[PDB]
Design a protein around this ligand. Structure first.
Ligand SMILES: *Cc1cc2c(cc1C)nc1c(=O)[nH]c(=O)nc-1n2C[C@H](O)[C@H](O)[C@H](O)COP(=O)(O)OP(=O)(O)OC[C@H]1O[C@@H](n2cnc3c(N)ncnc32)[C@H](O)[C@@H]1O
Ligand SMILES: *Cc1cc2c(cc1C)nc1c(=O)[nH]c(=O)nc-1n2C[C@H](O)[C@H](O)[C@H](O)COP(=O)(O)OP(=O)(O)OC[C@H]1O[C@@H](n2cnc3c(N)ncnc32)[C@H](O)[C@@H]1O
Ligand SMILES: [Cl-]
Ligand SMILES: [Cl-]
Lengths: 515, 515
């Protein structure tokens, strides 16, 4: 029987009794079969290491308040998820074995979509697909920022982990406005303008008055988000997605330095992607086995062959323009002039690309259309092993080259591939590297775990750290940011959750730690 | 003798002794004459209510750490200021009588200005004028976002109160990236990527990993900011400031609704201002006495006469376009088409305006050029009385009309004027109302205090609250946001400052409160 850390069967039984009284039997899952989908992980460790003791599906804020009351009474640690599609970051399983999962997928109402003020207010279980269908069927003049690869993922869960999309509203937390959280003591706290009785500005002005705390709850375990608002981009008259293909790995310095001023001036306004050959290949549903079944990493010689056969470059840049046709036309001239002056980069238009992949799904991503194309990355090697290694980088060419070379060296050392893309903000990149391996192979699984550890170590040696990470490594990554930060995080933790019931271990915040 | 609340002369003497040993006599100010500039306030209350017991000028982080050590030892409350130009919000004086002012103006180094990545990292005492002169003299391709009305105000102090400017980087806290604070226990905490040893991304990526806390320190008393970074806008090839004048007060509904889509699409990208007749007049250095010396508010009939004589409208909209000439030209056509279709609004160009005010200083504000023109508002009525009443509003015409009418009614009831402007974000307005009165007149000063209280009450009745407020009213405004918020703020306060030494009373956060 899986029980929470240091908690007795008797105390667990008492909590389950109370959870059933509060939520109804059908909302309290304690049977193995019922927990199966919750235990699925892609991390290089056996399922048992992240096995939940139970899952409870709350539907209302009052039920969430009831859940934390019970958790405090019997010291039950809960791992909160919204839509639970955190693949490559731990999926729906808890950070520590034995936690009860507080699954908020049933708390799924779209409270409001304002097409004039361009914002949405939603519950945790609201999915990207749900919002898209409502907006499209009702012809609302707004568009979404969508995070791959699941249409049943959603804005709340993604924003609580500070995920990203591919439109000009791609930095999801930047566009968040207003948040409601249930604190460990049961209090319902609304950030920003939400605490003002009769307010109509909760989704209008981010900060409110006094300390602005939305960020304190993201990537943290200081509260349970039950509602969140965010800004929506108004539907533009014209959308012009495009691609620029580069043939050589060494081109990354020039690509990034030519692109940066275009992003800094907002001439290209969306979160552009510069995808490596293998990310491009996997997103197009190509597999390593189609090219080689030899052990180890995929050789450069094979990759160049792949580039030859497919037209895919060493780097594949996907960007878009938005606005009136006249605005798009003027910005298109500026963009094409930059690449012409550079003397590198082949431009591919939406017309030329047609229904071919990856362009088709990239155009969908850049216009906020939910789609499942990127599940193809899971088939590059297959076997269910995938961890995102996502270091932050300056959007400076030399830095991107350095990080790409570092990651490639370490991955190859362990027989794995550099499958990556730079998601481009004006000043930063999320350098997203998909560490893919066959999790059904014990020898390879051990190499993947060792490889991920070495990637973290080698990047720290160069002053780099990741922006987000899977549950197996959340404590390790917390170390990257130093002891003073962890001490402050634990002081806040004690203040808002003295019984340590909210997801202890999240981002390395756990009162059992000596901080 | 002014002493901190409930603190003895003996304990205060011990702290002063230690402050002198740590900082040197010249950095410890306890004499009346030395405290004079610190005590100047524009709030409707006698100077004594905000009189500091002393001021200490620290220069280094180690000295700030030493100051908090001493404060904890002798329970000395400190009020931290950076450049201290918070006119209309309390100036440099403490929130509670008797606090020691920790004046960081000597901590004034520009640590870095990166013209490629477009960011700055500065100390608290760095001023807007200091940065402007460095950027201009060194021909750096970046521009500032400047908050009126002082060239010796600065980005750190302004951002710690979440102030605003008038370029596309006008929402100052939105562009902040990286912060260093000294906590009450002396620890030096760096947000975002700052805690990673050898990081080069502190001013590149805002969030870091785990809870992102920059916002928690703004408008709060949880730490002392000693360094702050922020993003800078790259200098555009072309800047095209312009104005649109509207003749009738009732036009505000249509002005705001026509402007909103232009802001939402980023076609007009800066924080536009829609200034009322009297704000326009005062900024042009006109005074009430030039038009009437009768008691009470300035009558509509006098204002219409003012409009006739000057060409100033009921609402005066100042905006700007930025980009290449071709981008500016296309956006100018879109903007002019909107106002032509509306059938209201007279466009005034930079060429037509020439060196005339207010256009001249507005063009400076919209291009980040420090200037002192708006000190003219202090001369509309003179006498040194000024408090900013700054309610948040949706950028929806009907809401703006409602708030303008509400404020005008309340101000007139108390014999004062509606002097205001809407600072326009895509979805929100900071509706900034300058409550001006003769502070040398006791009867009028009492009316101003009563008026400010009634403005707060009446706006709360309609679900509106302010984004920032003077020290005399910080506790009152905290009430606007509800008890759950205050309870959480006090729990965090206890956790990070158990001795209540950091500016108790700031934003209504004080451990002496029953929260
Ligand atoms: C596998 C994969 C993953 C992926 C991707 C492409 C592929 C092939 N592309 C991504 C992208 O474009 N952008 C991005 O940010 N992520 C991308 N991913 C990773 C992941 O699949 C998505 O991010 C997915 O959107 C995340 O799943 P979901 O949206 O369902 O979020 P969640 O699992 O519920 O929550 C994520 C974490 O947040 C914390 N949490 C969640 N809810 C709460 C509440 N209510 N309160 C407090 N904390 C909460 C948990 O830590 C949770 O694990
Ligand atoms: C009078 C007036 C005021 C004014 C204005 C026009 C006129 C005629 N126009 C403004 C504008 O365009 N935008 C805006 O945001 N404010 C405007 N004001 C008000 C004010 O003058 C300016 O905001 C000025 O920039 C503020 O002064 P300064 O920049 O010197 O900031 P400060 O006084 O040092 O600090 C402000 C408050 O922040 C907290 N504080 C400051 N430093 C710290 C540190 N290091 N750590 C923690 N907290 C800090 C204090 O609460 C302080 O009082
Ligand atoms: Cl996973
Ligand atoms: Cl003042």
């Amino acid at each position: 029987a899986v029980l929470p850390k240091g908690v007795t069967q008797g105390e667990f039984n008492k909590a389950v009794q109370k959870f059933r009284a509060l939520l109804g039997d059908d909302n309290v899952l304690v049977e193995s079969d019922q927990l199966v989908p919750y235990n699925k992980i892609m991390m290089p460790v056996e399922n048992a290491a992240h096995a939940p003791s139970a899952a409870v599906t709350a539907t209302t804020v009052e039920q969430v308040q009831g859940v934390v009351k019970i958790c405090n009474e019997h010291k039950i640690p809960i791992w909160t998820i919204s839509t639970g599609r955190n693949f490559g970051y731990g999926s729906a399983a808890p950070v520590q074995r034995g936690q009860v999962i507080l699954d908020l997928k049933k708390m799924n109402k779209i409270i409001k979509i304002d097409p004039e003020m361009c914002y949405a207010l939603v519950e945790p279980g609201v999915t990207f697909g749900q919002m898209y269908d409502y907006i499209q069927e009702n012809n609302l003049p707004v568009m979404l920022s969508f995070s791959a690869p699941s249409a049943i993922a959603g804005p709340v869960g993604n924003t609580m982990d500070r995920g990203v999309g591919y439109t000009p509203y791609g930095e999801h937390f930047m566009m968040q406005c207003g948040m409601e959280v249930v604190l460990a003591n049961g209090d319902v706290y609304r950030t920003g303008m939400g605490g003002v009785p009769g307010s109509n500005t909760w989704q209008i002005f981010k900060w409110g008055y006094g300390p602005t705390l939305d960020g304190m709850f993201t990537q943290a375990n200081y509260g349970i988000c039950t509602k969140m608002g965010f800004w929506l981009m108004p539907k533009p008259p014209v959308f012009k997605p495009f691609e620029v293909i580069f043939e050589d790995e060494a081109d990354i310095v020039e690509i990034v330095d030519a692109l940066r001023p275009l992003r800094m001036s907002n001439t290209i306004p969306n979160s552009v992607v510069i995808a490596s050959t293998l990310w491009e290949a996997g997103s197009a549903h190509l597999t390593r086995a189609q090219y080689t079944t030899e052990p180890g990493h995929t050789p450069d010689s094979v990759i160049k062959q792949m580039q030859k056969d497919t037209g895919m470059g060493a780097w594949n840049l996907y960007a878009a323009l938005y606005g009136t046709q006249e605005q798009v036309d003027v910005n298109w001239k500026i963009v094409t002039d930059v690449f012409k002056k550079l003397g590198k980069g082949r431009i591919v238009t939406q017309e030329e690309a047609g229904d071919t992949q990856p362009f088709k799904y990239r155009a969908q991503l850049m216009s906020g259309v939910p789609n499942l194309q990127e599940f193809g990355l899971y088939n590059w090697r297959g076997g269910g092993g995938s961890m995102w290694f996502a270091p932050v980088s300056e959007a400076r060419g030399s830095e991107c080259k350095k990080q790409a070379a570092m990651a490639k060296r370490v991955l190859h050392k362990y027989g794995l591939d550099y499958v990556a893309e730079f998601i481009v903000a004006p000043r930063d990149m999320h350098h997203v590297i998909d560490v893919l391996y066959d999790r059904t192979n014990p020898e390879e699984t051990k190499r993947a775990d060792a490889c991920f550890n070495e990637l973290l170590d080698e990047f720290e040696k160069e002053g780099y750290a990741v922006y987000r990470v899977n549950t197996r490594f959340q404590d390790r990554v917390a170390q990257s940011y130093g002891p003073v930060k962890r001490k402050l995080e634990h002081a806040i933790k004690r203040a808002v959750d003295p019984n340590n019931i909210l997801a202890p271990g999240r981002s390395g915040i756990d009162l059992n730690n000596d901080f």
